[PDB]
């Protein structure tokens, strides 16, 4: 199955508890540190040994994180380990942020341009995107010399291409016919 | 990656975040998780025997037939 | 509170609802913008329900809102349904305006109790020689017409509709389940032109329709017949093809996550038939006389669907491709066909002995098939030669020109009484017609017509 | 035979319009000469178009 | 021949081009296996929508799961790879439609393959649709002449009927259906020929025969050869059906031939097994009946009210129709097999071709004993309807007595005359390929046999007598043949005119 | 960039590559430090591809580096391939050193388009009397070869290889699909001893090679034939056994875990046959004609493999054990052999009447031979006795001396034109040669040679 | 007809070389509604060098 | 003059699957040294049955009569 199909129940349970107790910020840090720690090459190896029991894998991961996990977050790691799903931690953190972003009415937007775009232009783009998405947009600008001009915006599955590269492809498709 | 087992439900997982303790629910009781074609999957019911009678809300009765690790198919 | 579509695969749709507002099984749901109706079939857990669409799923997408109606699919019932055509959801499809019902009934109901069952053996004359002889029908009973493709299930059912409507004055219900759309149009205009339409309720879910419609249309037609039965009336229920209801369940079973049983059928095959078949019954309040056409896949009578259907019927009529290939119509097999009414205490010793005598001769002729194919009739004993000659006359005398079949041959239809049926076969068995040529018995209504045909 | 002759000609006319003429997609070289001033106009155009 | 002001059209393309940015809904390919693709993303994709991939390749969405989309590739899948982009098109599976398709050869998606340039179609329509309901249909009562004596006399076909052509391999199934298309060139009926799983060389020979006989300008050819993707072979019948429905819905008449529905079923079984769906009898899918029944239900005759409603009043007082001639191949002549039995349960009758007849020199090969038309008796023209009643019974008497020809010189007068007549009608029913007969020509052959004018003609000369009699009426009675050909009417004046001509023929030629 | 082996299960190997460097379907991969080649079959996701090894996997381990070649399996093409033996990958399997190719082509491509079809149906003159008269071959056609062993199958292939090269300036390719190593070696020496080896390219996919090798050898031989076709030639492609190509597909499909179809064959059975057979056609530049030996499982012509193969064959040549016993060569049955081009619209009325005339006489002689055997020669009339004499002359005139059979027959080989063939049989049927003895027609090129032989 | 077009093909193939520049410049000013003044100075080298 | 290689009914299926290859290897010793040898495999059907068992327990995909895709190659 897709890792997203298996991490949905755990991400939803952690989000409902964090929301009901007003701990939304705390759990973003706990899940983020568990995700990062579970992917380091010595922890990645310890979480695959055949002689360790589920409780020892959970305890080892709890001791490494230490103070970056409250009592509820420790009960959650013990639950994920007992159900044999510690490989889902990076995906659980990713899905928890999606639920939190839609709760706070915010959207993460990726932007690529031919040349560096100034703060005035970034805010001008953000204003329009916020109006159509009816969400607080957070832009992540980046450079791509492949484009000969313009910008390409992407927010989830929505893709708006204003780059002259895309315009040159449309011109080609209309003349090759 | 194994498919999502019948007890890997957001409510069951959230219940364990608040309290890991299994004894917080009597071994004599459980909760319906799924209802398909005459088959009900229950979470809990730890002291059930093979063939034992289950009382459901309303006067309906069922019988345990699959005593699995996380659920009981009746 | 509304839910949202989370998955779409063919005719099956998964919808997520709040944990405190999950719809019940068989509850009807509606997609907000498209108005498509869905029937809940399973509760998967975590607020998700699995449902079957009662229409086309082309153009639907994930994330669409769905409303729960609080009840099962409900259809109009009573006098307002007579002379009108309806779809699976109970909508009018005859362009004659809205239906004027006083009440609506849910299509899912429990079968009448053991204490409500009605006992009865009153003989029903069909006017068809082979049926009236070896498999007689009874008022308020169930009849099944078993047969492969092209053998005659519809032609025989249309002749039975024509002949039974002569002595029946009550209401009728016809359910078109997974059959030709043209056959529905032909029957509708025939009744409209004959002025018989105001006594019949019509329900249609033909081959063009999606799996959800073909899976529930049989329940919609039966729900209308149950209203008339419970009003204390005697009603006729005709089902165009009961096998299509089972097949629609097979098309959807894998999508519902069920493991396949023998030859790919749904594991619930027998239960799906039992839940439908027990509702089609006569009770102490009123009676339902029913005739059902039963399709046989690849001519194999041992197939799980036909095999599971025999146990639900009072009279079994089996049609055969071999008999139809010899030009003998209606094409009923007298050795495979049977009825519970074929009892000395119900039909009397004369009819019973005549039917038994016909089956004995045909069974003995069947055993001689390979001997006759290799060496011919001349090597048989004088007793076997006499029996073969009578068997060949009996096979031909079982043939009959039907009124609905007049379009295929120009030959006038014939109606034969039970008295004339018993007299003809008894005379052939006793040897009163040993001098007539066997071609004199082919396509003749009564034994007198065989005597006249022999003079040509 | 005359219909087949017209089909040959239109295949040549289309092959010329596709091999040559459509070579104008090299307008990227003209467009390669763009700079930050022109980029600002394209960002304003993109912003006005969501 | 090539002016520079014509190749300058590129300026018109650049002037018409719109370079404004537009929002697209996208995804990324995750896996690729045997023509099936898994995609991540595409949240706005609809069930049955066309998905666009690089290099001009298309896919169809069939599995909308919570976390991914499963799509079947509509062509060559070997060029697709993990990480490639996928885009929603906002369009349900569609094909071009209209008169611009007449005389063209196209793939299952409507792209031209004949090399004659683009198709200037002004409209498109959905490939998957539910056929019109009970109240919108009309009874079949208009004829469709195939041009064959045996078929038009014993198994008549009407406008809006579904007539199955069934038999073993290499016995004239394609010949009978292509000759039926060739005979429609002057009838006003437009034709569609769908080739499923056929060899490219066979398809090319059928197109050559359509133009050699002048029928190509009235026919649309849809091709999905033996090497094309199973997705296109499974979809080709629905594309052809959609192109044929264009005429039906507008108050016109059309004819469609599905050269092999049994090859369409084999293509659908492949996709279903690759998707791991549980198989049934002969390993076919549970929905194999729904595959053909949904296709063949569209072939129909629609009432004037349906045409008036569909055209928003532009077409009034005209019915529309789509006639279908599906073809099925049976192994070793077995009619009891699963797929043949399913299509017999869907169609309005069938023409059975017999291998023993075909190998015995009776090339038409129509098995009259089992072949039948459920709705053609009401559609047959008056002259052929009145003369054909004795033809069917004479062949039955022949089948029962045919083996006795080696000893029939020593039988009773009645049996001898029944056999002698059955032999003459059997010899008369033979006909060559690409040689169709008009109502008047078929009427002479049927009249000569039904009225007993062949009793003094030897079996070896019945064919020579027929060609001589038709040639004679074409010069001595041209006005009578022209009268019969108008509408196939049969009054006392026409009956008297035919016997007078045959008697003068027998007495002088 | 290179990938790493992540899993090995028998012949199936899974390789992991960087996300931006995943190889395409059918792309050839090379294991570092070993001669093992892998062909990509499926892309599983996460940069992992599933492949089939083109050799033994013994000694391979997880973590070995794998290099992508950037294209499908590429084989040597042109004149350099003639007289050499090669494997599935185009490597020489004889000890005659490296192939001197100037060009290499990938084994996977689309069939010639609808517009590339040559068009008019043209015959391929073989120079063999029985084949050219009773079962003519069309250019670009597929011929099914039937019969047992020890009946002349190799000698017929060698004669066809000689005639296309010497009389039509063409070339031949032999594809040994599931070839027996003993027989492959014997055949190579028989062609060398018969001087035909320099006129044919040999590709062997031996029985002891993995399923992927046996499956792809047909495409390797076909790719070599496509190069010769594009040089403006008419080519012969021989496939040792088309049944083994079908089985290799079933084996590979089972290794890849696909759900099996009816009778256990791969779900892709009809498509795999179509991909191979559609490339063998006549194009505007030249043509590839194919002779394929066919095996029928359990003698059942309705089995999915024979039934799928017969849809593509244009002719059928049946070799007979009984005809070989009479000393008549080639031992081809004139009554069991068939051809789709044996039609008056394709070959003209004169050729058709002559061929049908020969078949009618031979068919009637078969019947008369049973009468002579049971009742004696005195039962036959003077017309029957004359027909028996003509049948014996026709039967002997079908025999012919081959240039590759000079060792067995002693006499010099003969190439007979279609014109000479039709004229000879037409003259015997018309009775123009009824005065000559039957022994004058045995082992002679044309009717002229029979007239001259009768004077000795 | 095939020989007649071979002759002409050669003439027109050279005539087209005078138009590809104007087509490409029309394409460049289509992509963005600016720089039509600047394009005229680089045109002389660019037309050939494309 | 004979070498006898035995893999009895009670021995592990791996040994029964390998026995023909072991016996063939002992016979090939003479072939490669310019000598003649004769080998008898008393039941190739029993070797196939042993290989089918190993394949099904290793969870490899089954074909006709439940044999693995490589039974011809064996
Ligand atoms: N009426 C006819 N008179 C003479 N020959 C005929 C006639 N009808 C068909 N044939 C011949 O029969 C042969 C096979 O016909 P056709 O190709 O139509 O058969 P088919 O069943 O459709 O074959 P296939 O299964 O390959 O599609 C051809 O040689 C054709 O010319
Ligand atoms: N008496 C009859 N005369 C002629 N045909 C008959 C007769 N009885 C049955 N048939 C045949 O029955 C067939 C229709 O029945 P069938 O196909 O079994 O029913 P359904 O319409 O339910 O599929 C037609 O082919 C028709 O010719
Ligand atoms: N044309 C022929 N003339 C004489 N003998 C022939 C001829 N063709 C075949 N034979 C005989 O048949 C034998 C076997 O032929 P061959 O082609 O190898 O058949 P197969 O391959 O099936 O074993 C030859 O060795 C030869 O004795
Ligand atoms: Mg065909």
PDB file of C-alpha atoms in Angstrom, chain F residues 154-246:
ATOM      1  CA  UNK F 154      15.243 -30.011 -43.330  1.00  0.00           C
ATOM      2  CA  UNK F 155      15.648 -30.784 -47.068  1.00  0.00           C
ATOM      3  CA  UNK F 156      12.595 -28.594 -47.909  1.00  0.00           C
ATOM      4  CA  UNK F 157      14.049 -25.655 -45.894  1.00  0.00           C
ATOM      5  CA  UNK F 158      17.459 -26.052 -47.614  1.00  0.00           C
ATOM      6  CA  UNK F 159      15.813 -26.060 -51.097  1.00  0.00           C
ATOM      7  CA  UNK F 160      13.786 -22.878 -50.279  1.00  0.00           C
ATOM      8  CA  UNK F 161      17.014 -21.224 -48.935  1.00  0.00           C
ATOM      9  CA  UNK F 162      18.813 -22.123 -52.234  1.00  0.00           C
ATOM     10  CA  UNK F 163      15.990 -20.899 -54.520  1.00  0.00           C
ATOM     11  CA  UNK F 164      15.380 -17.465 -52.893  1.00  0.00           C
ATOM     12  CA  UNK F 165      19.148 -16.718 -53.025  1.00  0.00           C
ATOM     13  CA  UNK F 166      20.048 -18.040 -56.520  1.00  0.00           C
ATOM     14  CA  UNK F 167      16.796 -17.383 -58.497  1.00  0.00           C
ATOM     15  CA  UNK F 168      15.426 -14.212 -56.730  1.00  0.00           C
ATOM     16  CA  UNK F 169      18.642 -12.557 -55.310  1.00  0.00           C
ATOM     17  CA  UNK F 170      17.180 -12.709 -51.741  1.00  0.00           C
ATOM     18  CA  UNK F 171      18.514 -13.943 -48.365  1.00  0.00           C
ATOM     19  CA  UNK F 172      17.348 -16.162 -45.477  1.00  0.00           C
ATOM     20  CA  UNK F 173      17.363 -16.013 -41.656  1.00  0.00           C
ATOM     21  CA  UNK F 174      16.802 -19.017 -39.350  1.00  0.00           C
ATOM     22  CA  UNK F 175      15.488 -18.447 -35.787  1.00  0.00           C
ATOM     23  CA  UNK F 176      15.954 -21.541 -33.575  1.00  0.00           C
ATOM     24  CA  UNK F 177      13.326 -20.866 -30.858  1.00  0.00           C
ATOM     25  CA  UNK F 178      14.022 -23.493 -28.152  1.00  0.00           C
ATOM     26  CA  UNK F 179      16.581 -25.258 -30.408  1.00  0.00           C
ATOM     27  CA  UNK F 180      18.025 -28.697 -29.389  1.00  0.00           C
ATOM     28  CA  UNK F 181      21.869 -28.376 -29.293  1.00  0.00           C
ATOM     29  CA  UNK F 182      22.391 -31.800 -31.028  1.00  0.00           C
ATOM     30  CA  UNK F 183      19.994 -30.920 -33.896  1.00  0.00           C
ATOM     31  CA  UNK F 184      21.355 -27.333 -34.174  1.00  0.00           C
ATOM     32  CA  UNK F 185      24.872 -28.756 -34.724  1.00  0.00           C
ATOM     33  CA  UNK F 186      23.682 -31.414 -37.239  1.00  0.00           C
ATOM     34  CA  UNK F 187      21.717 -28.761 -39.232  1.00  0.00           C
ATOM     35  CA  UNK F 188      24.771 -26.446 -39.424  1.00  0.00           C
ATOM     36  CA  UNK F 189      26.879 -29.265 -40.977  1.00  0.00           C
ATOM     37  CA  UNK F 190      24.071 -30.362 -43.367  1.00  0.00           C
ATOM     38  CA  UNK F 191      23.823 -26.755 -44.718  1.00  0.00           C
ATOM     39  CA  UNK F 192      27.654 -26.587 -45.042  1.00  0.00           C
ATOM     40  CA  UNK F 193      27.710 -29.935 -46.930  1.00  0.00           C
ATOM     41  CA  UNK F 194      24.806 -28.717 -49.158  1.00  0.00           C
ATOM     42  CA  UNK F 195      26.593 -25.349 -49.919  1.00  0.00           C
ATOM     43  CA  UNK F 196      23.629 -23.231 -48.564  1.00  0.00           C
ATOM     44  CA  UNK F 197      25.284 -21.959 -45.317  1.00  0.00           C
ATOM     45  CA  UNK F 198      26.722 -18.783 -47.019  1.00  0.00           C
ATOM     46  CA  UNK F 199      23.090 -17.832 -48.043  1.00  0.00           C
ATOM     47  CA  UNK F 200      21.530 -17.862 -44.505  1.00  0.00           C
ATOM     48  CA  UNK F 201      22.060 -16.181 -41.083  1.00  0.00           C
ATOM     49  CA  UNK F 202      21.586 -18.534 -38.051  1.00  0.00           C
ATOM     50  CA  UNK F 203      20.245 -17.413 -34.630  1.00  0.00           C
ATOM     51  CA  UNK F 204      19.874 -20.137 -31.949  1.00  0.00           C
ATOM     52  CA  UNK F 205      17.979 -19.862 -28.625  1.00  0.00           C
ATOM     53  CA  UNK F 206      18.788 -23.261 -27.153  1.00  0.00           C
ATOM     54  CA  UNK F 207      16.510 -25.283 -24.809  1.00  0.00           C
ATOM     55  CA  UNK F 208      19.001 -24.970 -21.888  1.00  0.00           C
ATOM     56  CA  UNK F 209      18.785 -21.109 -21.907  1.00  0.00           C
ATOM     57  CA  UNK F 210      16.512 -19.065 -19.515  1.00  0.00           C
ATOM     58  CA  UNK F 211      12.911 -18.144 -20.592  1.00  0.00           C
ATOM     59  CA  UNK F 212      13.953 -14.581 -21.637  1.00  0.00           C
ATOM     60  CA  UNK F 213      16.472 -15.927 -24.217  1.00  0.00           C
ATOM     61  CA  UNK F 214      13.935 -18.292 -25.865  1.00  0.00           C
ATOM     62  CA  UNK F 215      11.297 -15.504 -25.949  1.00  0.00           C
ATOM     63  CA  UNK F 216      13.573 -12.824 -27.575  1.00  0.00           C
ATOM     64  CA  UNK F 217      15.356 -14.992 -30.257  1.00  0.00           C
ATOM     65  CA  UNK F 218      12.410 -14.600 -32.674  1.00  0.00           C
ATOM     66  CA  UNK F 219      12.818 -10.765 -32.489  1.00  0.00           C
ATOM     67  CA  UNK F 220      16.617 -11.051 -33.035  1.00  0.00           C
ATOM     68  CA  UNK F 221      16.194 -13.106 -36.251  1.00  0.00           C
ATOM     69  CA  UNK F 222      13.328 -10.820 -37.350  1.00  0.00           C
ATOM     70  CA  UNK F 223      15.554  -7.719 -36.787  1.00  0.00           C
ATOM     71  CA  UNK F 224      18.256  -9.225 -39.056  1.00  0.00           C
ATOM     72  CA  UNK F 225      15.576  -9.966 -41.712  1.00  0.00           C
ATOM     73  CA  UNK F 226      14.255  -6.337 -41.481  1.00  0.00           C
ATOM     74  CA  UNK F 227      17.732  -5.021 -42.494  1.00  0.00           C
ATOM     75  CA  UNK F 228      17.796  -7.250 -45.621  1.00  0.00           C
ATOM     76  CA  UNK F 229      14.183  -6.166 -46.478  1.00  0.00           C
ATOM     77  CA  UNK F 230      15.234  -2.477 -46.350  1.00  0.00           C
ATOM     78  CA  UNK F 231      18.113  -3.225 -48.835  1.00  0.00           C
ATOM     79  CA  UNK F 232      15.260  -3.728 -51.420  1.00  0.00           C
ATOM     80  CA  UNK F 233      15.084  -7.573 -51.153  1.00  0.00           C
ATOM     81  CA  UNK F 234      12.599 -10.437 -50.661  1.00  0.00           C
ATOM     82  CA  UNK F 235      13.642 -12.420 -47.518  1.00  0.00           C
ATOM     83  CA  UNK F 236      12.728 -15.810 -45.974  1.00  0.00           C
ATOM     84  CA  UNK F 237      12.411 -16.038 -42.159  1.00  0.00           C
ATOM     85  CA  UNK F 238      12.303 -19.580 -40.752  1.00  0.00           C
ATOM     86  CA  UNK F 239      11.018 -20.071 -37.179  1.00  0.00           C
ATOM     87  CA  UNK F 240      12.008 -23.522 -35.809  1.00  0.00           C
ATOM     88  CA  UNK F 241       8.843 -23.843 -33.699  1.00  0.00           C
ATOM     89  CA  UNK F 242       6.203 -21.111 -33.121  1.00  0.00           C
ATOM     90  CA  UNK F 243       4.715 -23.148 -30.199  1.00  0.00           C
ATOM     91  CA  UNK F 244       7.937 -22.720 -28.136  1.00  0.00           C
ATOM     92  CA  UNK F 245       7.700 -18.910 -28.605  1.00  0.00           C
ATOM     93  CA  UNK F 246       4.205 -19.087 -27.020  1.00  0.00           C
TER      94      UNK F 246
END
